Each structure stands twice: as structure tokens, then as C-alpha cells.
Amino acid sequence: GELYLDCVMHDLRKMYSEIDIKVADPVVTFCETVVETSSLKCFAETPNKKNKITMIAEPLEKGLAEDIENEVVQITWNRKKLGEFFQTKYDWDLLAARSIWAFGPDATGPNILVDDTLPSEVDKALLGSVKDSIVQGFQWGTREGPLCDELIRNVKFKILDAVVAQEPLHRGGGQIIPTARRVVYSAFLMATPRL
Amino acid sequence: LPFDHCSLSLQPFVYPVCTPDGIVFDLLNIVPWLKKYGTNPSNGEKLDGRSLIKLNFSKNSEGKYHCPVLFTVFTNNTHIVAVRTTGNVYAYEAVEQLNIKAKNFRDLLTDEPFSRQDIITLQ
Amino acid sequence: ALNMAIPGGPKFEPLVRWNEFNDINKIIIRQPIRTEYKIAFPYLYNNLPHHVHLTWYHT
């Protein structure tokens, strides 16, 4: 607030520093969101051109962001308990209820990663092997933000396809994360974003 | 869309750092995504701890991402060669003509001479 | 001390007599910063505050 920052600036100018200091005009910090779903099923690929990630982004519901932010539901919950929590009051499909991977720009952040891949469920052990790197790519992408370097909130990121290289190792050891960041930014930009 | 941006983060040049594998990337991309990987993320090659070379986020006598000796635009479009030991990056043909004819491995006026085998490809 | 006055209040002589913060392409204006905010929160809205007394808040 104004009084809080006035006290901080008075303590900066009079106590911890004797330096004359220019102060800019106050502004706020914004966030980035979406309104309508991704009209184009956007995708990207690794620098070793074998893995191909196709993912679309759509906005969440009304109470979901404040339910995550007030820690009503957590990633430390049971998968069945989390699926029941989604299914009873949000009417989600149980396939979609078991599809939830990660939350937000941080822990209990207001974004939801959902993995819905039918041709990539035949190598779902390899999908679970690359799932953690997909998670840190999602955390980095929603923490940074492509629009004006602000946080991203109230977005469900729905994975459509994951062409994972069979036993990637050398290419699946750090190239997955910036690919996932580019996937998150490209899926966010194709879904009419708002401040 | 050009090659002047970072390879991994797909962002423009702000605080770039080079590597001994021939690829220069963002310092935040090299720090967070290769904190314990120990390998070059451009092609999966092994990268040492001292193999990375800093190129920005400090004081330079050129003031831009240009040739430090030739004082011309040694950007991603131009053939740019960087000194591995010194950290200065110039145009490849200008540094080759300087260090070939008059053996001018130094700067234009700072006069920092070195060997001719420390030049590597930046990108 | 700031050489600025409310129209109801008195006026005095001045006491003491490029910035990129004043760049017009980086400043969002919705409400203009009037004199009253520079008096009520004088360390916030004023560059170089000297011999400034903090006012009493709400009672």
C-alpha cells in the first residue's frame, strides 16, 4: 500500500542510506490469462528432432484457482482423493481426474497441467519418465510468462500428443525442459490471452 | 526468427555466455538447466565446468555485441570468432587478417596480445 | 518545504531555490499525482524531500 511503501522509502532515505534518491511513480504487477481455448493445436520439438510435444491451453473454472491457492486440494493428496474432489464439485471425467500432473508456477499455484494422450499411452512408462522434466518446463514457463514477464494464472494446460524417443537418455536429459517452455508459450499465445 | 536469439530459451541476447562445444546460450539457461547436468544442452555433448566462457553481464570496451578489435558488426549473421582465453569476440576474417599478416592478436587500442590458437567458433 | 500549496492554505517562498523516470513512454497515467498526495505521503511521491514533517494519521 501507499503508507507501507512510504514508510519503507522514508527508512531507506533517512536510516540506512544518506543518498538522495529518485522515486518513480507507483504501478502494479499484472498477470496473464486466457479466455477462449487454443484455436490451433500448436506443438514443438526437441533440438534432437525425435520428441514432439503437442499441447493446448484452455482456461480453468471459477472456483479452481482460489481452491488451489487456499490449499483445499494439494499434490500431496491421494490420486483417488484428488479425483473425487474434482469429480464431485467440478463434474470432471475420471480419465481427466486421473490426468492431473502438476500445479502452477510454484507449489499450489493457479495453473493445472492435464495429460490426455491416447497414442502416447502405449509408452506411458516413458511418458512418466519424461513427466518430471515436463513438470519443470511447465513450472518455468508459467513462472516466467511470455507476454510481459509476469505470472500466468487460471490456465489448464492440456497435453494432446507426446512423441517421445525410445530410451532418449542423451536427448532426454535436459533438452525436454526448454522444449516444454516453448510448448507452454506457444499454446498460451494461441488462446487469445488477456492481462 | 534469426540466430541472434538464444537456442534453448528462444530469447534475444542480453547476458549470453559461450561454451567450448561451439554454442553460445543464455547464462540463466546454462545455470538453471545445467546446474548438475554437466553436459552441453545444444547437442548432448559433455561440457566441463571450466569449458563455459562468459561473454556479457560485465564491462566491455565495445559497448555492444560487435567486433572488439575490428569495431564492426560481428553479429550472428557475420562470421564471428571468439577468443577462448580472452573472451573477446571479433569478426573471423578481420581477426584472421590481423593475426596472419602483422600478427595482431591484440585489440585495436587496448593492446592485449595473446596466442593465435585460442580462437573458436561462437555459433 | 516542498514549495507547493493547497488553495485554502498559505503560500511561501521556495526553500531550496534528465531523468528516465519522467519518460512519457514508460509512465501510465490514470489519475494525476496531485499536491495532496505529495503532502500526505511525502517520501513516496517526492524526489528530494528535505525538512519535511510527517503528518498525523487518522484519529
Binding site: 514443438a44 511470455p146 510481459c148 509476469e150 499465445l189 | 528462444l10 | 513512454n25 509512465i27
Partner: peptide
């Protein structure tokens, strides 16, 4: 006015910290 507000906040924030131009297909 109201329809120009998000464009103004976008342009002024990007001039404050980053780059002015924004490309929708800047990654792909």
C-alpha cells in the same frame, strides 16, 4: 479509455522491462 487499457499496460510494461514488439509465433 476502456478498450485501449490492456494494450496500454502491455506496451508500457514491455517498454519498462523488455522488448516493445510482440510476436504471436515468436517461438513457433
Amino acid at each position: 479509455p476502456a478498450p485501449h487499457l490492456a494494450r496500454e499496460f502491455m506496451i508500457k510494461t514491455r517498454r519498462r522491462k523488455g522488448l516493445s514488439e510482440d510476436v504471436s509465433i515468436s517461438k513457433f
